[PDB]
Amino acid sequence: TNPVAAWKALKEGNERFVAGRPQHPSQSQKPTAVIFGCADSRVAAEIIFDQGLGDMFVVRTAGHVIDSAVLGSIEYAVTVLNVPLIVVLGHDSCGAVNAALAAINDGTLPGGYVRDVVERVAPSVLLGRRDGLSRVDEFEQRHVHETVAILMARSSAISERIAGGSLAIVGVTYQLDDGRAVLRDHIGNIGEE
Amino acid sequence: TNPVAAWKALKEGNERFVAGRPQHPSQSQKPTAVIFGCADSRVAAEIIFDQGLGDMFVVRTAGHVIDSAVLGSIEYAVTVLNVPLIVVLGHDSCGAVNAALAAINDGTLPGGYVRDVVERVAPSVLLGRRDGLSRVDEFEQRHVHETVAILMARSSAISERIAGGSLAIVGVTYQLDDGRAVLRDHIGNIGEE
Ligand SMILES: [Mg+2]
Ligand SMILES: [Mg+2]
Ligand SMILES: [Zn+2]
Ligand SMILES: [Zn+2]
């Protein structure tokens, strides 16, 4: 019902997952959070954060790429379903980011609608390279950061609710082999204090 | 490695889920299938089909709406990752479909990027109404059907691989309270014979 309670639920759920003591095995009302994840993730966010049925509204694309339908999906959860928290969720060994890194090397983009994915991931890799980054996971962390920024800049409905106090957005990553959800970016009050 | 083996894996996995005897509790290589699902689904496809880690490449938007990034995501799995099967996965009590039905009644679309979602779901509801449909689940089944058609029409890379023998696309629905994955549409050879 607010960003503090929503983030508390996810943080505790990931503590239970990491501990190997889940409350909602195979997931055992209106959603607590929007999760914006990557299509090549190897594990469901509902497992990572140990949530039950209907707790999460989940949007997923290759490399977290955003177009109008992706944006409208997230805006729908916030404005229609009144969801109080958006989590941009990144992961280790992201293949989409590796594909973007490959295209930059070769100086040309792939064809068809695959172009549309790589051209939306490549800007973050280029910013990353300007700042001295060189590894897929470093680029993915930067791309999570940039994706949070894109969502606020492109959607007045999102940005207004964050300013107004009823929405927060966080950038979070995990490494599959350790399971910990690492909080990176946080815009709005989520009760960390 | 081909659409027959891919569909066999999913069908058997859903039989194990329904039976209450899963091999991959909390999900216990290159993906076996693309799943295109709805963001307001209440349960992960990895549970419904009892799959392990990395087995599924999952794209999700509100109401299965398609834009360039969604399409490119699916095309990426097929052309880069050589995934042999796309599953358009629908579900009961879909809120996005109910939101589209509401907008049609009122004769005007919602604002911001929410417009972009409802205007991509509304065409299926209108076709549904022309054919005498009236319930959310009937409209969702029709919308699964239309979404399979859209993917083939909009992507030459997808359509060519289906014609060529290396890709199939299926439309599947489930009702949460019974768990069964119901096969509705099937383009290509998936070994049902
Ligand atoms: Mg902060
Ligand atoms: Mg057929
Ligand atoms: Zn990824
Ligand atoms: Zn739905």
Swiss-Prot record, chains A, B:
Please list the cofactors this protein needs.
Answer: Zn(2+)
- InterPro entries named in the record: Carbonic_anhydrase, Carbonic_anhydrase_CS, Carbonic_anhydrase_sf
Instruction: State one molecular function term (GO).
Output: zinc ion binding
Pfam families on file: Pro_CA
Please summarize the record's notes on activators and inhibitors of this protein: Inhibited by sulfonamides and sulfamates.
Gene3D superfamilies per record: Carbonic anhydrase
What is written in the cofactor note of this entry?
Binds 1 zinc ion per subunit.
Secreted: present as a keyword of the record? no
Entry EC number(s) = 4.2.1.1
Q: Which reaction does it catalyse?
A: hydrogencarbonate + H(+) = CO2 + H2O
Role summary: Catalyzes the reversible hydration of carbon dioxide to form bicarbonate.
Its family remark reads:
Belongs to the beta-class carbonic anhydrase family.
Protein's recorded name: Carbonic anhydrase 2
